[PDB]
Enzyme design. Structure first.
Site, PDB file in Angstrom:
ATOM      1  N   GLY A 162       4.082  -2.353  -8.180  1.00 10.06           N
ATOM      2  CA  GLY A 162       3.715  -2.788  -6.829  1.00 10.06           C
ATOM      3  C   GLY A 162       2.313  -3.336  -6.696  1.00 10.06           C
ATOM      4  O   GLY A 162       2.033  -4.014  -5.727  1.00 10.06           O
ATOM      5  N   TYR A 169      11.068  -5.353  -0.439  1.00 10.86           N
ATOM      6  CA  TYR A 169      11.248  -4.487   0.751  1.00 10.86           C
ATOM      7  C   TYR A 169      12.336  -5.024   1.628  1.00 10.86           C
ATOM      8  O   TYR A 169      12.191  -6.132   2.183  1.00 10.86           O
ATOM      9  CB  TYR A 169      10.008  -4.466   1.674  1.00 10.86           C
ATOM     10  CG  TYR A 169       8.779  -3.953   1.009  1.00 10.86           C
ATOM     11  CD1 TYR A 169       8.061  -4.774   0.168  1.00 10.86           C
ATOM     12  CD2 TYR A 169       8.323  -2.633   1.233  1.00 10.86           C
ATOM     13  CE1 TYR A 169       6.969  -4.296  -0.468  1.00 10.86           C
ATOM     14  CE2 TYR A 169       7.203  -2.158   0.606  1.00 10.86           C
ATOM     15  CZ  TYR A 169       6.552  -3.015  -0.237  1.00 10.86           C
ATOM     16  OH  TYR A 169       5.476  -2.641  -0.893  1.00 10.86           O
ATOM     17  N   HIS A 180      -3.294   0.871   6.839  1.00 11.40           N
ATOM     18  CA  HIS A 180      -3.920   1.129   5.560  1.00 11.40           C
ATOM     19  C   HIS A 180      -4.661  -0.164   5.129  1.00 11.40           C
ATOM     20  O   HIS A 180      -4.328  -1.277   5.603  1.00 11.40           O
ATOM     21  CB  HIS A 180      -2.813   1.500   4.564  1.00 11.40           C
ATOM     22  CG  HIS A 180      -1.867   0.368   4.330  1.00 11.40           C
ATOM     23  ND1 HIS A 180      -0.997  -0.102   5.309  1.00 11.40           N
ATOM     24  CD2 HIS A 180      -1.740  -0.472   3.273  1.00 11.40           C
ATOM     25  CE1 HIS A 180      -0.313  -1.134   4.829  1.00 11.40           C
ATOM     26  NE2 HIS A 180      -0.774  -1.401   3.608  1.00 11.40           N
ATOM     27  N   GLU A 182      -5.282  -1.949   1.096  1.00  9.71           N
ATOM     28  CA  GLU A 182      -4.557  -1.945  -0.186  1.00  9.71           C
ATOM     29  C   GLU A 182      -5.238  -0.970  -1.089  1.00  9.71           C
ATOM     30  O   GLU A 182      -6.448  -0.609  -0.904  1.00  9.71           O
ATOM     31  CB  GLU A 182      -4.583  -3.346  -0.778  1.00  9.71           C
ATOM     32  CG  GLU A 182      -3.961  -4.415   0.133  1.00  9.71           C
ATOM     33  CD  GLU A 182      -2.473  -4.071   0.431  1.00  9.71           C
ATOM     34  OE1 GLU A 182      -1.619  -3.866  -0.503  1.00  9.71           O
ATOM     35  OE2 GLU A 182      -2.155  -3.892   1.599  1.00  9.71           O
ATOM     36  N   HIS A 268      -4.229  -3.101   8.021  1.00  7.42           N
ATOM     37  CA  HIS A 268      -3.074  -3.627   8.793  1.00  7.42           C
ATOM     38  C   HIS A 268      -2.011  -2.613   8.928  1.00  7.42           C
ATOM     39  O   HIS A 268      -2.002  -1.598   8.199  1.00  7.42           O
ATOM     40  CB  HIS A 268      -2.563  -4.852   8.068  1.00  7.42           C
ATOM     41  CG  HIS A 268      -2.326  -4.624   6.590  1.00  7.42           C
ATOM     42  ND1 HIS A 268      -3.337  -4.717   5.648  1.00  7.42           N
ATOM     43  CD2 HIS A 268      -1.207  -4.250   5.923  1.00  7.42           C
ATOM     44  CE1 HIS A 268      -2.834  -4.481   4.451  1.00  7.42           C
ATOM     45  NE2 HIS A 268      -1.533  -4.238   4.596  1.00  7.42           N
ATOM     46  N   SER A 280       6.110  -8.489  -2.342  1.00  2.83           N
ATOM     47  CA  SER A 280       4.699  -8.364  -2.295  1.00  2.83           C
ATOM     48  C   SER A 280       4.082  -7.907  -3.646  1.00  2.83           C
ATOM     49  O   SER A 280       4.754  -7.351  -4.524  1.00  2.83           O
ATOM     50  CB  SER A 280       4.254  -7.464  -1.062  1.00  2.83           C
ATOM     51  OG  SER A 280       4.327  -6.084  -1.361  1.00  2.83           O
TER      52      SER A 280
HETATM   53  C1  LIG Z   1       4.163   7.182   2.737  1.00  2.00           C
HETATM   54  N1  LIG Z   1       4.023   6.353   1.486  1.00  2.00           N
HETATM   55  C2  LIG Z   1       3.620   7.032   0.267  1.00  2.00           C
HETATM   56  C3  LIG Z   1       2.531   6.549  -0.537  1.00  2.00           C
HETATM   57  C4  LIG Z   1       2.157   7.235  -1.718  1.00  2.00           C
HETATM   58  C5  LIG Z   1       2.863   8.417  -2.088  1.00  2.00           C
HETATM   59  C6  LIG Z   1       3.932   8.944  -1.320  1.00  2.00           C
HETATM   60  C7  LIG Z   1       4.300   8.239  -0.143  1.00  2.00           C
HETATM   61  C8  LIG Z   1       4.279   4.911   1.582  1.00  2.00           C
HETATM   62  C9  LIG Z   1       3.844   3.861   0.707  1.00  2.00           C
HETATM   63  C10 LIG Z   1       4.140   2.480   0.934  1.00  2.00           C
HETATM   64  C11 LIG Z   1       4.892   2.101   2.094  1.00  2.00           C
HETATM   65  C12 LIG Z   1       5.345   3.231   2.998  1.00  2.00           C
HETATM   66  C13 LIG Z   1       5.028   4.535   2.691  1.00  2.00           C
HETATM   67  C14 LIG Z   1       6.163   3.012   4.266  1.00  2.00           C
HETATM   68  C15 LIG Z   1       7.040   1.775   4.120  1.00  2.00           C
HETATM   69  C16 LIG Z   1       6.322   0.524   3.594  1.00  2.00           C
HETATM   70  C17 LIG Z   1       5.323   0.678   2.423  1.00  2.00           C
HETATM   71  C18 LIG Z   1       4.158  -0.156   2.883  1.00  2.00           C
HETATM   72  N2  LIG Z   1       4.599  -1.510   3.220  1.00  2.00           N
HETATM   73  C19 LIG Z   1       3.699  -2.538   3.490  1.00  2.00           C
HETATM   74  C20 LIG Z   1       2.314  -2.532   3.169  1.00  2.00           C
HETATM   75  N3  LIG Z   1       1.493  -3.613   3.491  1.00  2.00           N
HETATM   76  C21 LIG Z   1       1.959  -4.706   4.110  1.00  2.00           C
HETATM   77  C22 LIG Z   1       3.301  -4.838   4.415  1.00  2.00           C
HETATM   78  C23 LIG Z   1       4.199  -3.799   4.127  1.00  2.00           C
HETATM   79  C24 LIG Z   1       5.657  -3.918   4.522  1.00  2.00           C
HETATM   80  O1  LIG Z   1       6.377  -2.887   4.662  1.00  2.00           O
HETATM   81  O2  LIG Z   1       6.075  -5.080   4.666  1.00  2.00           O
HETATM   82 NI    NI Z   2      -0.434  -3.430   2.726  1.00  2.00          NI
END
Ligand SMILES: CN(c1ccccc1)c1ccc2c(c1)CCC[C@H]2CNc1cnccc1C(=O)O
Ligand code: NI
Ligand SMILES: [Zn+2]
EC number: 1.14.11.66
Length: 345
Positions: A162, A169, A180, A182, A268, A280
């Protein structure tokens, strides 16, 4: 961009072909000030012929997004469900139970998202490893953007899913991504392959600290046990709260066929309008190196992403390496400033 508002760009096929160079350009135009920019690709470019042969694509780890809270302050807990295909997903998304409510303008749908996000919890087909770009597409290929971020893999030998590889997604109405920046305060690139839109909120990097102070004030418990709790990606905060507390922010809606770019330290959050798929990854520029040295990391989980900065400081700041190794490099980032590769424009 002294309003630091989200800018949209329409590159020609000829500006489009050099990725890092177009990032350099949009920054000469101030696009980084807002922390998020839209780039609409030239009309004839397409990463893939069509998307009707992916029904059998497996989503290994889909998540049900339970949200808890009130008064525009919420916490999102992401519950791992069993493996499911694109077909099974689309059919759940398009069902009367999860499909997009009636609206005739974004604003109306926004009010429904904020009024309804803790009910009927959706499923998000997030963090799927893979690209939907055809092997042969050379422009803006999320699989091989060829930025300096490439030193991690090429010099350090490290794969981070990632971050230096692509994620897909699969969204459905009301699936969300929490506030958050990045990992390592990298850039990211986000391409909406097909389906319904994805809406975005951004806070300019020059105001990020205000958003941290807000969140710290609202989640004191969360804030004591970790130095960067927002990196858990569980905190949602409504635009009414931001406005109420004087946090500068903008919004934009991304449609199918469009790129969004987030910039270092660009906070964002956002939500999907309905069934869709985005791809992404992260990327860097020269300017990013300092954000990497300075990024404030999750002090609480053993698993979080951390990139060693040595390879970048030796290669690009060779003169400061010992100062830096000696805790004595103390550059202050000016967020208003474009990456040095912007000099030509
Ligand atoms: C909670 N979590 C977690 C991280 C570490 C370890 C255990 C869990 C975690 C991590 C990642 C995510 C989510 C949750 C919730 C859904 C989405 C993605 C983030 N998505 C985006 C980011 N920037 C921009 C756009 C998008 C998008 O969805 O289009
Ligand atoms: Ni992001
Ligand atoms: Zn933490």
């Amino acid at each position: 961009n002294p309003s630091a508002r989200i800018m949209t760009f329409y590159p020609t096929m000829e500006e489009f072909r050099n990725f890092s160079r177009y990032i350099a350009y949009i920054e000469s135009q101030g696009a980084h000030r807002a922390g998020l920019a839209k780039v609409v690709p030239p009309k004839e470019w397409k990463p893939r012929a069509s998307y009707d042969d992916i029904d059998d694509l497996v989503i290994p780890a889909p998540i049900q997004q339970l949200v808890t809270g009130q008064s525009g302050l919420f916490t999102q807990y992401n519950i791992q469900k069993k493996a499911m295909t694109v077909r099974e997903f689309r059919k759940i998304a398009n069902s009367d139970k999860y499909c997009t409510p009636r609206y005739s303008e974004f604003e109306e749908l926004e009010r429904k998202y904020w009024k309804n996000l803790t009910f009927n919890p959706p499923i998000y087909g997030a963090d799927v490893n893979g690209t939907l770009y055809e092997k042969h597409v050379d422009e803006w290929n999320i699989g091989r953007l060829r930025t300096i971020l490439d030193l991690v893999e090429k010099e350090s030998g490290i794969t981070i899913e990632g971050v230096n590889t692509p994620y897909l997604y699969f969204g459905m109405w009301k699936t969300s991504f929490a506030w958050h920046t990045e990992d390592m305060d990298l850039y990211s690139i986000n391409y909406l392959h097909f389906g319904e839109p994805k809406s975005w909120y951004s806070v300019p990097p020059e105001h990020g600290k205000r958003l941290e102070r807000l969140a710290k004030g609202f989640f004191p418990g969360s804030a004591q046990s970790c130095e960067a709790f927002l990196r858990h990606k569980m905190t949602l905060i409504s635009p009414l709260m931001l406005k109420k507390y004087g946090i500068p922010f903008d919004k934009v809606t991304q449609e199918a066929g469009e790129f969004m770019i987030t910039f270092p330290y660009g906070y964002h959050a956002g939500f999907n309008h309905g069934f869709n798929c985005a791809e992404s990854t992260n990327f860097a520029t020269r300017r990013w190196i300092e954000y990497g040295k300075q990024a404030v990391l999750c002090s609480c989980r053993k698993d979080m992403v951390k990139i060693s900065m040595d390879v970048f400081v030796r290669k690009f700041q060779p003169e400061r390496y010992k100062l830096w190794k000696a805790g004595k490099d103390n550059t202050v980032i000016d967020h208003t400033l474009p990456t040095p590769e912007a000099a030509e424009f």
